Design an enzyme around this catalytic site. Structure first.
Site, PDB file in Angstrom:
ATOM      1  CG  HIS B  39      32.351 -28.224  40.581  1.00 25.11           C
ATOM      2  ND1 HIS B  39      31.527 -27.228  40.009  1.00 25.11           N
ATOM      3  CD2 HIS B  39      31.480 -28.881  41.505  1.00 25.11           C
ATOM      4  CE1 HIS B  39      30.387 -27.400  40.515  1.00 25.11           C
ATOM      5  NE2 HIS B  39      30.344 -28.196  41.350  1.00 25.11           N
ATOM      6  CB  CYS B  89      34.651 -25.326  36.818  1.00 23.33           C
ATOM      7  SG  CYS B  89      33.541 -26.624  37.782  1.00 23.33           S
ATOM      8  CG  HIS B  92      30.077 -26.073  36.117  1.00 18.81           C
ATOM      9  ND1 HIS B  92      30.500 -26.654  37.307  1.00 18.81           N
ATOM     10  CD2 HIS B  92      28.949 -26.914  35.932  1.00 18.81           C
ATOM     11  CE1 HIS B  92      29.491 -27.735  37.617  1.00 18.81           C
ATOM     12  NE2 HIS B  92      28.751 -27.857  36.544  1.00 18.81           N
ATOM     13  CG  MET B  97      32.909 -22.958  38.933  1.00 21.82           C
ATOM     14  SD  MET B  97      31.662 -24.317  39.104  1.00 21.82           S
ATOM     15  CE  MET B  97      31.195 -24.053  40.737  1.00 21.82           C
TER      16      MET B  97
HETATM   17 CU   LIG Z   1      31.815 -26.237  38.553  1.00 19.16          CU
END
Ligand SMILES: [Cu+2]
Ligand code: HEC
Lengths: 254, 105
Positions: B39, B89, B92, B97
């Site tokens: 992340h 993120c 993602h 996120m």
């Molecule tokens: Cu993530």
């Protein structure tokens, strides 16, 4: 990355040609190896070890133009029934071999397909995938028989994004025939904006291709250029490979 | 101050809870790679009042945080008024996120 392949091919990672979708974008081809035990008994953990080697001294163009080492990732395709082994069944000798990687299923439903990456290549050129072998007694569709195991192994940056745009780890061909009337490397913030123009004398038209930071030229001013010719070197030092192994789910008796 | 952003609410989902952290001018908060990784978060030079990354750049992070159970920290100057310094993120970016650091003002 594996994640793009997940996002837009959940049921077609092994295209019907037998090629793996990584190839679509990771264009260059380099070898991948996979050793697998000759045979295994029901409900036992074993290791499908995959290798993704490459001359480590090489360096690649990062997204920003600077040069950096490579990262590695992969896809391992197992038959239905086979799946990532749970933690309690991975013994400590095997646990230290896997380091601290995190296998994801390709899709929550596809337990039998298992991915990993991106991870640094220096550390993970080879990767050890634990795999629990299934049990025909507790699984009718599975049987004591030979079975295929395909694999994909990538290293370094690919050439095309899911949107179809190119990346700066690839060849920037000309979009034009003509002569080159002007050139200028300029500095922006992270890396150079290369600028240029072409005079399609044939069609009486001017265009201005643009080249990002990181590559370096072949051509010069005043040189005749043909449509589709290589303006830059190809900076891709990584690539993609794939293979398959066979595994015998074996009856405890004979 | 250094608070923890559990990058995919550990026993929940791939989300950034509680999404709107109303921090103060400075707060050395961290981004924690708990599960389904990695992340990394670039900083919104797009979605915010002072959408000016140059302010620090360290603000905008990125590049696969392969830290299975560990976090990275992002500090500000003190010269941080009414700011929604939103974080990304990267692998993602869209699956809930995304977070909005809100430095009071
Ligand atoms: Cu993530
Ligand atoms: C539709 C696009 C696409 C597909 C499909 C794809 N990749 Fe990628 N990949 C890319 C591009 C482009 C990059 C460069 C991203 C960047 O700029 O950092 C990349 C980067 C990577 C990297 C990081 C390399 C590095 O050093 O930073 C790895 C590893 C990787 N891909 C593995 C895989 C594997 C394994 C699969 C599938 C099982 C896959 N990729 C499929 C496009 C793709």
């Amino acid at each position: 990355y594996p994640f793009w392949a997940q996002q837009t091919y959940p049921e077609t990672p092994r295209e019907p040609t037998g090629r793996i979708v990584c190839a679509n974008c990771h264009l260059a081809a380099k070898p991948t190896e996979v050793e697998v035990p000759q045979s295994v008994l029901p409900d036992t953990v074993f290791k499908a070890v995959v290798k993704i080697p490459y001359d480590t001294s090489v360096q690649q163009v990062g997204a920003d133009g600077s040069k950096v080492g490579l990262n590695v990732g992969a896809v391992l395709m197992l038959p239905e029934g086979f799946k990532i082994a749970p933690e309690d069944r991975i013994p400590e000798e095997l646990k230290e071999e896997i380091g601290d990687v995190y296998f994801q299923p390709y899709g929550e439903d596809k337990d039998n397909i298992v991915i990993v990456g991106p991870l640094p290549g220096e550390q993970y050129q080879e990767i050890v995938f634990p795999v629990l072998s299934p049990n025909p007694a507790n699984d009718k569709n599975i049987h004591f028989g030979k079975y295929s195991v395909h694999v994909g192994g990538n290293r370094g940056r690919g050439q095309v994004y899911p949107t179809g745009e190119k990346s700066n780890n690839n060849l920037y061909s000309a979009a034009a025939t003509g002569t080159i009337s002007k050139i200028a490397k300029q500095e922006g913030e992270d890396g150079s904006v290369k600028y240029l123009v072409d005079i399609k004398t044939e069609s009486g038209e001017v265009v201005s291709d643009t080249i990002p930071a990181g590559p370096e030229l072949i051509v010069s001013e005043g040189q005749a250029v043909t449509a589709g010719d290589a303006l830059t070197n190809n900076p891709n030092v990584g690539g993609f490979g794939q293979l398959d192994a066979e595994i015998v789910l074996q009856d405890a008796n004979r | 101050e250094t608070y923890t952003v559990k990058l995919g609410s550990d026993k929940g989902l791939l989300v950034f809870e509680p999404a709107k952290l109303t921090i103060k001018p400075g707060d050395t908060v961290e981004f924690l790679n708990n599960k389904v990784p990695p992340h990394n978060v670039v900083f919104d030079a797009a979605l915010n009042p002072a959408k000016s990354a140059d302010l620090a750049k360290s603000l905008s992070h990125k590049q696969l945080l392969m830290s299975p159970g560990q976090s990275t920290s992002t500090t500000f100057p003190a010269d941080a008024p009414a700011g929604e310094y939103t974080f990304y993120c990267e692998p993602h970016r869209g699956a809930g996120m995304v977070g909005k650091i809100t430095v009071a003002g």
